[PDB]
Amino acid sequence: IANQPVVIDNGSGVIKAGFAGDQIPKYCFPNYVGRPKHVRVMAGALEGDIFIGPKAEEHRGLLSIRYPMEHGIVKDWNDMERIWQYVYSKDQLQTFSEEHPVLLTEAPLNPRKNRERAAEVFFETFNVPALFISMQAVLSLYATGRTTGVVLDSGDGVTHAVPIYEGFAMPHSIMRIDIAGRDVSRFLRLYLRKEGYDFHSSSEFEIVKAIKERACYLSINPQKDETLETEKAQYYLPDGSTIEIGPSRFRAPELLFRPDLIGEESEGIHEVLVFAIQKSDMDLRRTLFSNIVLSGGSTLFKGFGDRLLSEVKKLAPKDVKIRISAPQERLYSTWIGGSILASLDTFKKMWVSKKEYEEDGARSIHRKTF
Amino acid sequence: IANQPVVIDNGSGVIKAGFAGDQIPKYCFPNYVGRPKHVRVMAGALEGDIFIGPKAEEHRGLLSIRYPMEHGIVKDWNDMERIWQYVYSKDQLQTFSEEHPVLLTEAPLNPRKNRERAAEVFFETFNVPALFISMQAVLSLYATGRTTGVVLDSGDGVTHAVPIYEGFAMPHSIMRIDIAGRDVSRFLRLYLRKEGYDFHSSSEFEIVKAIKERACYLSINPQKDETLETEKAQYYLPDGSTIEIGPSRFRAPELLFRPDLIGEESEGIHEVLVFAIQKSDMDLRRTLFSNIVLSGGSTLFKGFGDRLLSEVKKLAPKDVKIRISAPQERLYSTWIGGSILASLDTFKKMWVSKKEYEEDGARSIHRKTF
Amino acid sequence: IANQPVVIDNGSGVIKAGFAGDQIPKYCFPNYVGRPKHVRVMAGALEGDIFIGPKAEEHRGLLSIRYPMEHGIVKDWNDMERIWQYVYSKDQLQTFSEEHPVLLTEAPLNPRKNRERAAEVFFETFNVPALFISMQAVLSLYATGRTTGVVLDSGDGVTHAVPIYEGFAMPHSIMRIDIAGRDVSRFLRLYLRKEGYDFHSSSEFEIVKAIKERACYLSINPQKDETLETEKAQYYLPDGSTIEIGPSRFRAPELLFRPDLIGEESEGIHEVLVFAIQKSDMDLRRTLFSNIVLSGGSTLFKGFGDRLLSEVKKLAPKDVKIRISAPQERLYSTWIGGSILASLDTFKKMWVSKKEYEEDGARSIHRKTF
Amino acid sequence: DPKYADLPGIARNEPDVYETSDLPQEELTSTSVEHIIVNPNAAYDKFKDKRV
Numbered sequence A, B, C: 001i002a003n004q005p006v007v008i009d010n011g012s013g014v015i016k017a018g019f020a021g022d023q024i025p026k027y028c029f030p031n032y033v034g035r036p037k038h039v040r041v042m043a044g045a046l047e048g049d050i051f052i053g054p055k056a057e058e059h060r061g062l063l064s065i066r067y068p069m070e071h072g073i074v075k076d077w078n079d080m081e082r083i084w085q086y087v088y089s090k091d092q093l094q095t096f097s098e099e100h101p102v103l104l105t106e107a108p109l110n111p112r113k114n115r116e117r118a119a120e121v122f123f124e125t126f127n128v129p130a131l132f133i134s135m136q137a138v139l140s141l142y143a144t145g146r147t148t149g150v151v152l153d154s155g156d157g158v159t160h161a162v163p164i165y166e167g168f169a170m171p172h173s174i175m176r177i178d179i180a181g182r183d184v185s186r187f188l189r190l191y192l193r194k195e196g197y198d199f200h201s202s203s204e205f206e207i208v209k210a211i212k213e214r215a216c217y218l219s220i221n222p223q224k225d226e227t228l229e230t231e232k233a234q235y236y237l238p239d240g241s242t243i244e245i246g247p248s249r250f251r252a253p254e255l256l257f258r259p260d261l262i263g264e265e266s267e268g269i270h271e272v273l274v275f276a277i278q279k280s281d282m283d284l285r286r287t288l289f290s291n292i293v294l295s296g297g298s299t300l301f302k303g304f305g306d307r308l309l310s311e312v313k314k315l316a317p318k319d320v321k322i323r324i325s326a327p328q329e330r331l332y333s334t335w336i337g338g339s340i341l342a343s344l345d346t347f348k349k350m351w352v353s354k355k356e357y358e359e360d361g362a363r364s365i366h367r368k369t370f
Numbered sequence D: 001d002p003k004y005a006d007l008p009g010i011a012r013n014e015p016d017v018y019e020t021s022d023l024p025q026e027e028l029t030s031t032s033v034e035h036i037i038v039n040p041n042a043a044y045d046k047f048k049d050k051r052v
């Protein structure tokens, strides 16, 4: 029989999860595995050593870090297995998968074996009765309380723009390129060795990401802020050293506009979005220029939206309105939209029974996902 | 079955011993090995010449001394065996080899062949059921109760700093310089010749060591105190004499920070410390700037820790609360922590399966050497 | 001038130099610093207090050794001044710092600050008519006469592999490990005390270098040779003593393939190079399987080639023919390629007026090197 | 201090602690465009019977 819904999110960078009727997911933590990095010798401390969570969020140069879900694509299935099992903790779930409805978040344009394999997990290892995974775009629209809109994200290493009209769209008109913040930190690391800054460990890179998320802004003027002379302001270390920065703090996030510099023939969110709009109706595009949605936590910056609108207005059509500013929390909004969807009443249509799923396979999965 | 083991704390020169779960090492004395420097004919003496124990102090000016445990490494195997046999005396032990297990100390970074030959001795000549030997830093951990931190211990001729967090090793991070008080007494002897003296005899040198461990301290300031002139306090002479000292008494342990005085491309205690700090995560360093306690009587000096703190301030980065940690147990602390250890589940997971051990050869635990 | 510009094999471990058209780097010497270890008092001794030449590496026990280069990058610029004065010695040139253009070498992925610092010295101390510095990889293919290929250098500063398609470099595909044979020597010293060998001096270090280049070799089988029952051959020490060898003679160079054993996170030179191949086109790699170039002094080992071949065999793709070159001069060839470059009239962009440097600085050279 | 009396090695005056002197966003108010508010409950009430 029906039970209490569990609102979980496939967090590319940081996984998010909670239950129905809540307002904030109480379980938000990174997407890696922390296993023994050093020589564990004398007994008397916390052992098992494959520690993920507050210990990993606390002890850094002690456990090797391994991310299995890169570009929203899980490669180390076993890692997500025990990652999910960590989600089943007394710290985290305290319940059983086989007794409550669980909502998760689908990632656009991925293979079938992924979700099929996951379905096999939660229907064989776990035996979840009610399970569904879907797009956060409509959820974001519920957060706006609107129906039409073009949802753009910035995950861990994922970006995609979706034109939407009341939950009716063209699948051919959607655009997607897996790229975000993690690679930005990678390019930051490039700048580091470009000016000789030795940063290559796992946790070391995590620290670099913290620096990236903190000591970086978005300079709207490209050449005007690149051709000049910097000051190379310094920022502390957890250890305590305050090291210089320079133009790099805005050069690395502005790289999204030029994948050619990273050796990539991409198009950039601006062109990505524009082309997505180009793949649509004619007069309806204006309505959609008004209704546009932003998402993804990598979007977090200063001089961000103004730079975006600057690009947009450089390639704008005949003066059409644009409306996407800073809501409460874009990431949370997706989870909150999951809570919204969990609050549905005719929600029974979001799944098939386990027994029938056993009699279904990939068939019902793709015949009912779309 | 009931066989209380014996905690035997070896060392550079000194050896300590007492059964498991005790509180004070029942018998303690150094590596002094003596035999009559003269010729006796008339009856009344003793015969055998291997007269080591309280008789040595009772008969200092009669025998020749030696210390075959060079830098904690045995040379005169036969003599060490005799030493251990002296330990096996009734009033010294009253127990047999097979009757009880034994715990022992491992000075790291030494040839394991020493341990090989010794293991063969205690498990073939003597037939102890099990004998475990281990890192002296672990002993300090049990004494402190803490599991995180670095420990630099110093006997009479060896100093080693062990940085280990939560009882979990970082072998590369460990550092050492093997030189201590022995040469400081020799340095004192050099100063004596500068003062016009010579105490070339073995027992004479022992008296000199008594002066060393008796008439010394550490001046916090090197030159600020070196440019002045003391009153040259006098030391009582077991000769019923008393002779001046000079500022040398504290100037002599400056060698601990200056190998220049001995003329060797070495570094320094604080330098070893700093390098071990460099050899770790940028995180734990600050945290481990509180969990360090040093052992051995080589630390018993007036102005020891204070001058060391001055060195810390000169070398450590800014704003880290670090004063100095030292108990009055630093000598015995090793044996004490070893007793703490041995009074537990040691034999439950770590010991020598004597029979099977030699059946598999000495290389078996020499593979389990860590 | 109508004569030979200064060709300098700016060597990591051993720096060499000569001129254009010539095929002999007339002067070769390591990157050390020779000052004294003692103070002459006797009137009529040898003086200078700064020594290079054979006299420097003669009285090692009398001359303080200080290697000034770090990861292929010196930081003791004063020593470089003195080094270049020795380069300008009567034994070498008897020339001026204006008579010929200067060609030096480098490694990529370095701070531009080095190039800055360099040219600052080269023009504040010298009045060089033309200065240029680049990658020896170009010069390497010049020595091979090829156009494309991947070259991995093994110097004592940095070991780095560069993929090359007719000079059209792929900065997003070059790999660079900062390991050296110096660390292997240090690692050998670890084996020394493991085997009980008391060595810590700077003078001993060069003896270990002789051991490295002579007593060490490469064992092709990775773990099959790890279990070989050693015989511990004995090397007769040059002073007159003799010391055993053990399996360490091939164990230590394997750290270059298993850097994690020392704690350095990397993937082994072989895999790193394969990753560089992976950072490229698809069928152009097929050419690179035939295009395999060796470089660096830290490649001269008995067993080196074939073992590395087996490494490649494990890293081999699906049934693709692979050709591997092995030049004789894995170092000197670069100097000769530089002599070829200096023998070019098309050196137009490379020759830079000093006045131009006054006008702009190293940035002007960065435009040329980028 | 029972054991301490037996210890010939005792000297006071320095503690056993290492502690010296002690000395203890535009993605929210972007004036560029407009955004939405959270309003969970009333949004569900807004979308009350808007099912299939």
Ligand SMILES: Nc1ncnc2c1ncn2[C@@H]1O[C@H](COP(=O)(O)OP(=O)(O)O)[C@@H](O)[C@H]1O
Pocket (backbone or CB within 6 Å): A010, A011, A012, A013, A014, A015, A154, A155, A156, A157, A180, A181, A182, A212, A213, A214, A296, A297, A298, A299, A300, A301, A331
């Ligand atoms: N201050 C910040 N600046 C930029 N990005 C941030 C900041 N804080 C967090 N993030 C981003 O959060 C993202 C994590 O992916 P996210 O957008 O959360 O997708 P998901 O919810 O699927 O994990 C990372 O890409 C990272 O850039």
Ligand SMILES: Nc1ncnc2c1ncn2[C@@H]1O[C@H](COP(=O)(O)OP(=O)(O)O)[C@@H](O)[C@H]1O
Pocket (backbone or CB within 6 Å): B010, B011, B012, B013, B014, B015, B153, B154, B155, B156, B157, B181, B182, B212, B213, B214, B295, B296, B297, B298, B299, B300, B331, B332, B334
């Ligand atoms: N009162 C003292 N003053 C100075 N040094 C001392 C004193 N007592 C002992 N020592 C030195 O400290 C060392 C104790 O450290 P420990 O490791 O127990 O020594 P050992 O290695 O000889 O057992 C002794 O070897 C001795 O050289």
Ligand SMILES: Nc1ncnc2c1ncn2[C@@H]1O[C@H](COP(=O)(O)OP(=O)(O)O)[C@@H](O)[C@H]1O
Pocket (backbone or CB within 6 Å): C010, C011, C012, C013, C014, C015, C154, C155, C156, C157, C180, C181, C182, C212, C213, C214, C296, C297, C298, C299, C300, C301, C331
């Ligand atoms: N015969 C040899 N066998 C092994 N290694 C060698 C030999 N000769 C030189 N080397 C290595 O070469 C390194 C010196 O760096 P090198 O290759 O000379 O770079 P560069 O020429 O740029 O200075 C040292 O690490 C040394 O071990």
